[PDB]
Ligand binder design. Structure first.
Ligand SMILES: O=P(O)(O)OC[C@H](O)[C@@H](O)C(O)NO
Ligand SMILES: O=P(O)(O)OC[C@H](O)[C@@H](O)[C@@H](O)NO
Ligand SMILES: [Mg+2]
Ligand SMILES: [Mg+2]
Lengths: 214, 215
């Protein structure tokens, strides 16, 4: 339907995350336990946030690189809806995580941060993967890498292959028009919501502009 | 120089990890906080293990994919000696982690689990990475991927490029002779030590075989 709004909780502690959820939990559709929070607090972050917000989709942004069955199971036992597996994981890592996701009626997203190939994209599809995260790396961003037409072309191509596409990577309100006409599953905002002078206005403006555009 | 021995603590909780370290802390060179323990407990696992064993090298196997400076700094502020960065991460992720590692007199390894290229390997060298982890994925292993000749050639080639190479991925004692003749920096064992009937004896066996094969 409309692209969903996901907030990324890239916080080092639960209390710092709650400074954000206490403002905007009900202003978004998906609550992400960011990688920073996974590492900071471990999978307790997942269990706690779902207990708080059981009606929201909770994503554990673990960026699983190996041990797909074990790491996926930990996140799902903690009541995750969705987990991420990093694009360079062995194909059997993605398969494994996907098998466990199915036991729990959750799902796996392949996280397209850094280097990957079109052949691997095909492999994910054959394995049954239905979601990808098209992601301008935070560190690439800080080195001056901008969003551009090659990203739009790549997102359209992933969409045509059958994936539901999330878009993320230092997204600002003003960025949303670049993706107009594409059936984007989710837009993620971390900093542009958490660090805004008004996190509630920031999230409502993302939701408004999405409604305008789609 | 003998390859060193690293134990991987791929435990879901600290107490499970301690059931291993109380036995083998003194039998190995590097204590790894496994990716599974980092995700199970968070970076506290790093801080606590270092506090128990401050004389040992502690490796935080975070497999950082992005946000190099932030994630590295969390690990290093928890008193990690080494952190890992996954090989597909944007080159600025590695660079970012390395800069932080240098503030703490630490170091970064690139984790070669999954796909990568030789030009990328050169980029790592130019950025100043000195260590790589040649890793047969646990899940590749489970699907029947064996160690083989192609792995020898790649390892030697990494070493010739100037990297200290760590080898890992379901290693059993019988696999060590595959690598004889190559200046391997570290072998990692997780399951083969932790799940042995006697972890102590398992670690000692690895050390004996290493000392015979590289002596
Ligand atoms: O909008 P951002 O601050 O970039 O956060 C969203 C992004 O997807 C992060 O959670 C992330 O995973 N960075 O790697
Ligand atoms: O010997 P193993 O049980 O395979 O554990 C070592 C390995 O390096 C793990 O710690 C790991 O990182 N797997 O991805
Ligand atoms: Mg994230
Ligand atoms: Mg490990």
């Amino acid at each position: 339907s409309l692209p969903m709004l996901q907030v990324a909780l890239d916080n080092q502690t639960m209390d710092s995350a709650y400074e954000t959820t206490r403002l905007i939990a009900e202003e978004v559709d998906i609550i992400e336990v960011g990688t920073i929070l996974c590492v900071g607090e471990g999978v307790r972050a997942v269990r706690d946030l779902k207990a708080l917000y059981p009606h929201k989709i909770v994503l554990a942004d673990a960026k699983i690189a190996d041990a797909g069955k074990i790491l996926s199971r930990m996140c799902f036992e903690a009541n995750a809806d969705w987990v991420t597996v990093i694009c360079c994981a062995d194909i059997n890592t993605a398969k494994g995580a996907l098998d466990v996701a199915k036991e729990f009626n959750g799902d796996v997203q392949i996280e397209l941060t850094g280097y990957w190939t079109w052949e691997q994209a095909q492999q994910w599809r054959d394995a049954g993967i239905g979601q990808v995260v098209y992601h301008r790396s935070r560190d690439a961003q800080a080195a001056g890498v901008a969003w551009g037409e090659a990203d739009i072309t790549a997102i359209k191509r992933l969409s045509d292959m059958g994936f539901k596409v999330t878009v993320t990577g230092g997204l600002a309100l003003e960025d949303l028009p670049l993706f107009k006409g594409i059936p984007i599953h989710v837009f993620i905002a971390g900093r542009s919501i958490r660090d805004a002078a008004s996190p509630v206005e920031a999230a409502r403006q993302f939701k408004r502009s999405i409604a305008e555009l789609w």
